Specification:
The PDB classes it as virus. This is part of a larger assembly, with 2 copies of chain A (30 residues), 1 copy of chain B (297 residues), 2 copies of chain C (237 residues) and 1 copy of chain D (197 residues). Chain A is largely without helices or strands. Chain A has one helix at residues 23-26, and one strand at 19-20. Chain A is built from 1 helix and 1 strand, in the order E-H. Chain A is rod-shaped and about 50 Å long. Classes of the chains: A little secondary structure (30), B mainly beta (297), C mainly beta (237), D mainly beta (197).
């Protein structure tokens, strides 16, 4: 990954967040 | 409970069941929860170790592809006699994601979105085909694209003193270059953009429904920098957008009927199924008719 | 009261059962080496044979005398069980039987559901024994002529000595029975001897004053711990 | 999400989302069937699993169908739900269908039953090629029959309804993204020119 | 030189063999859990399927071009293997092939016996592809049109790159080959794809000056490590 | 060898596997 720009929003896309929680949609019950 | 998932789940070996008070195939749909019955509870299973990845369905991968958002054509010539509706060697565009349906339908799967936008500009030219013209070769023109905030002043003509760009960002590029490219940050006054907005933009009752100016990225103003040549050309500009660094909230039912307008969610449907107002799926003769039934001979 | 049964690729759920019966307190098993006779390695198909099969349903009506089926004969033409039966000289298995019948809270009636070992039938008012076509009915089963004497000159009143359950329409809507291997020999030829007869007898007849409807009775049967010996060419009934 | 099982010429709007069942005079009868080809137009297409899958080209893993009974409290009955793996024609008789994967359902205090459609394939993935009869595409069939009969008293309605739902299990996977065939245009939309003026 | 093969209830003895061949140095096995795909518990019949079946014999004559059979197609109608094939969506197995041919010390001749993976046939002098009835011959097999180019425009001279043996009438009277599972997928549908083709080609023709006699060639095949998945109703070719 | 792409299939060709076993073709006998 190469980035020489000063502002952090200039960077390449981020594709490493594998965290999930289906239960907030599939099991929304007390 | 939140956890890290890099592959699809394994299957475990299972035996005969005959047990009183236990019924894993029965469920209570009225609660609003989805069925929790597992394959090992429904049938006898073998052990299977599963190596299928899940990365191509990540939200960053699903949304982060460059898509067409604007396409404009105009004549590059002497405009001294042209009518007032004409793009006289320049144009202005208000940036939106609603005009081309493949990007619109994908963004409308979510209620709120936060992203930075990578913009790419592609230009092409042709000689005007009037009966007085041969072909003559194609010029390597210079173009200027200036970014202007929502509702601010925009140039009135190709050679206005407004193009001096003293604090506005401008990009200058040639037709022989690779396409021009830059990133616009997440610019909303709120923590996310609203993809849908159930309200009115102003304190009086006469305002627009469903439009929220805080979600408008801005204006793009584009001109040819060269003076006109002795002969006319047609120039076409295409703009592409790629979202990046994405967060998304509250998924929604997909659009089924065709779009009518960029201003609203209005609908009409096809004249007959599929995608008609009274019928989304294509018909079959009866609930007992199998439509692609295999024939044995 | 609530039950789920799962065998092979098949499952049954019921919301109004009344426990279930294990005949003589036994459970099905494979033949151990200290009881074995035939020396060839046995075929044991597992999930291909050991699953529920459902027969034709029968209509419960005001004049019904009751119904019967013989095992293994009722299954000898069905699925991979029937194919293994036709290609082998010898067989052995247990069975799991599930009987189904439902009606409204305004209906009344009671069925005795009973499994009879070695139910050798008699004929009525003659010296001649029953013929092959009187006994070997296959998947259709038969009906009782004189259910009060079980078609054998004994009696219905004492039939509760055999493995049984009731369906009483105010109480329950299904009956379940588990049957072990029940024979004088460790294996048998499946085309000429039946180990078990299932019998269904309406002791209290169906009745209501609400809207009339067709009330069927349905039988599902699963073989358990199937084994086959003496492989050859296919032979039918 | 809800299946559109009643996709027939006479059913209008919300009527397409339910199947009506009634008492019968004859035993062992077929009620309905469902095609399982989750890329093609059919009862599964306009669902959360169908819509998201049509942005991709290959798929794998198990599905669940769940049915809810919506008759009166006094109504009773039993049904058999069957899944048949591919190889030939859809079964038309209960004694043929019960040889496949199946569940027998009793109506009662629990309103609903689940049928698992297990992943059974030679290849790791199935393929959204434009051919329903390909060995890389066809999934087989779902069919429903009477196990007993629908039985109701005189003051209940004589006809009762089923709602069918579908979802994927957590063994499910998708790959090779593409433009969706569920949307398109031949022209610019209304007010699209006003963005340039 | 001397060999005995024993599988299920079947045995073969030969007094004039020439070793035996294992294709690519492999041996048949069941599908392990780290290579599996289908989630249902598999049917594994053991001694009911894994045994020798013998096909029709063919006559070796002065004009013969050679013979071929496709697997599993040649066995899809035979015994308990054919019944399991017709009731299941998916299958997997290896094979053991034994080819038999004898003649006097005054005869001469040589057969190439070869197992070809994915033998996709070509037609001669046309643009049109072979039809279903050109390919799917069943237990009868077929004959070569142009054995010198293997009916595919390659050549017979290089066919020794595949698993093979020879029968040379002065040396030996049988050939034996063991075949593993050979496919891009862990299981397959047995009615539309063939993994292996057996081919028998007379490279040196049969000859003698002694008394004339009919000289047959005979093929025996045993499936090994059979598995079946996706149980349903019976479906045929 | 230079590679700045994220997906491993984007890389240059691999020409370092010198492992052989001719005997599976030349000696397929017990």
């Amino acid at each position: 990954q190469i980035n020489f720009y000063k502002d952090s929003y200039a960077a390449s896309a981020s594709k490493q967040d594998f965290s999930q929680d289906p239960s907030k949609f599939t099991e929304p019950v007390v | 409970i939140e956890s890290i998932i890099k592959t699809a789940t394994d299957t475990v070996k299972s035996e005969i069941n005959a047990e009183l008070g236990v019924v894993p195939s029965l469920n209570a749909v009225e609660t609003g929860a989805t069925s929790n019955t597992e394959p090992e509870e429904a049938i006898q299973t073998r052990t299977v170790i599963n190596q299928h990845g899940v990365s191509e369905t990540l939200v960053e991968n699903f949304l982060s592809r460059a898509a067409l958002v604007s396409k404009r054509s105009f004549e590059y010539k002497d405009h001294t006699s042209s009518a007032a509706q004409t793009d006289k060697n320049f144009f202005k565009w208000t940036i939106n994601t609603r005009s081309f349906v493949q990007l619109r339908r994908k963004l409308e799967l979510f209620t709120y979105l936060r992203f930075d936008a990578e913009i790419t500009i592609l230009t092409t030219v042709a000689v005007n085909g009037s009966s007085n013209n041969t072909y003559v070769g194609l010029p390597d023109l210079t173009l200027q694209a200036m970014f202007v905030p929502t509702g601010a002043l925009t140039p009135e003509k190709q050679d206005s003193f407004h193009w001096q760009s003293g604090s506005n960002a401008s990009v200058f590029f040639k037709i022989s270059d690779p396409p021009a490219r830059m990133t616009i940050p997440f610019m909303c006054i709120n923590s996310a953009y609203s993809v849908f907005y159930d309200g009115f933009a102003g304190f009086e009752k006469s305002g627009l429904y469903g439009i929220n100016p805080a979600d408008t990225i801005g204006n793009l103003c584009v001109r040819i920098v060269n003076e006109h040549q002795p002969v006319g050309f047609t120039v076409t500009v295409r703009v592409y957008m790629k979202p990046k660094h994405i967060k998304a909230w509250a998924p929604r039912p997909p659009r089924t009927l065709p779009y009518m307008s960029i201003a609203n969610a209005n609908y009409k449907g096809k004249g007959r199924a599929p995608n008609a107002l009274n019928a989304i799926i294509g018909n079959r003769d009866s609930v007992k008719t199998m439509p692609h039934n295999i024939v044995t001979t | 009261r609530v039950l789920q049964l799962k065998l092979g690729n098949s499952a049954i759920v019921t919301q109004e059962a009344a426990n279930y019966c294990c005949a003589y307190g036994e459970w099905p098993n494979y033949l151990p080496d200290h009881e074995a006779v035939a020396i060839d390695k046995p075929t044991q198909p597992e999930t291909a044979t050991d699953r529920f099969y459902t027969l034709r349903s029968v209509k419960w009506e005001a004049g019904s005398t009751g119904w019967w089926w013989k095992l293994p004969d009722a299954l000898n033409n069905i699925g991979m069980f029937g194919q293994n039966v036709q290609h082998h000289y010898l067989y052995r298995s247990g069975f799991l039987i599930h009987v189904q019948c439902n009606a409204t809270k305004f209906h009344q009636g009671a069925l005795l559901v009973v499994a009879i070992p070695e139910h050798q039938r008699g004929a009525h008012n003659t010296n001649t024994s029953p013929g092959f076509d009187d006994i070997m009915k296959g998947e259709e089963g038969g009906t009782f002529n004189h259910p009060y004497v079980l078609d054998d000159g004994t009696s219905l009143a004492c039939a509760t000595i055999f493995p049984h359950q009731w369906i009483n329409l105010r109480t329950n809507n299904s009956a379940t029975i588990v049957l072990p291997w029940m024979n004088a020999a460790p294996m048998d030829f499946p085309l000429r001897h039946n180990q078990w007869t299932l019998a269904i007898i309406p002791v209290v007849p169906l009745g209501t004053r609400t809207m009339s409807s067709m009330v069927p009775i349905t039988v599902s049967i699963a073989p358990m711990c199937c084994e086959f010996n003496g492989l050859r060419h296919a032979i039918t009934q | 999400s809800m299946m559109e099982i009643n996709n027939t010429e006479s059913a209008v709007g919300m009527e397409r989302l339910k199947v009506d069942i009634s008492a019968l005079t004859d035993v062992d009868q077929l009620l309905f069937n469902i095609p399982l080809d989750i890329q093609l137009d059919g009862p599964l297409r306009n669902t959360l699993v169908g819509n998201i899958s049509r942005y991709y080209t290959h798929w794998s893993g198990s599905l669940e169908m769940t049915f809810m009974f919506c008759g009166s409290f006094m109504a009773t009955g039993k049904l058999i739900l069957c899944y048949t793996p591919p190889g030939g024609s859809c079964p038309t008789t209960r004694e043929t269908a019960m040889l496949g994967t199946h569940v027998v359902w009793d109506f009662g205090l629990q309103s609903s039953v689940t049928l698992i459609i297990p992943w059974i394939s030679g290849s790791h993935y199935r393929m959204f090629n434009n051919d329903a009869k390909s060995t890389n595409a066809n999934v087989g069939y779902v069919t429903c029959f009477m196990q007993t009969n629908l039985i109701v008293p005189s003051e209940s309605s004589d006809t009762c309804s089923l709602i069918g739902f579908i979802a994927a299990k957590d063994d499910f996977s998708l790959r090779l993204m593409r433009d969706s065939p569920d949307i398109g245009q031949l022209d610019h939309l209304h007010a699209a020119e006003a963005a340039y003026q």
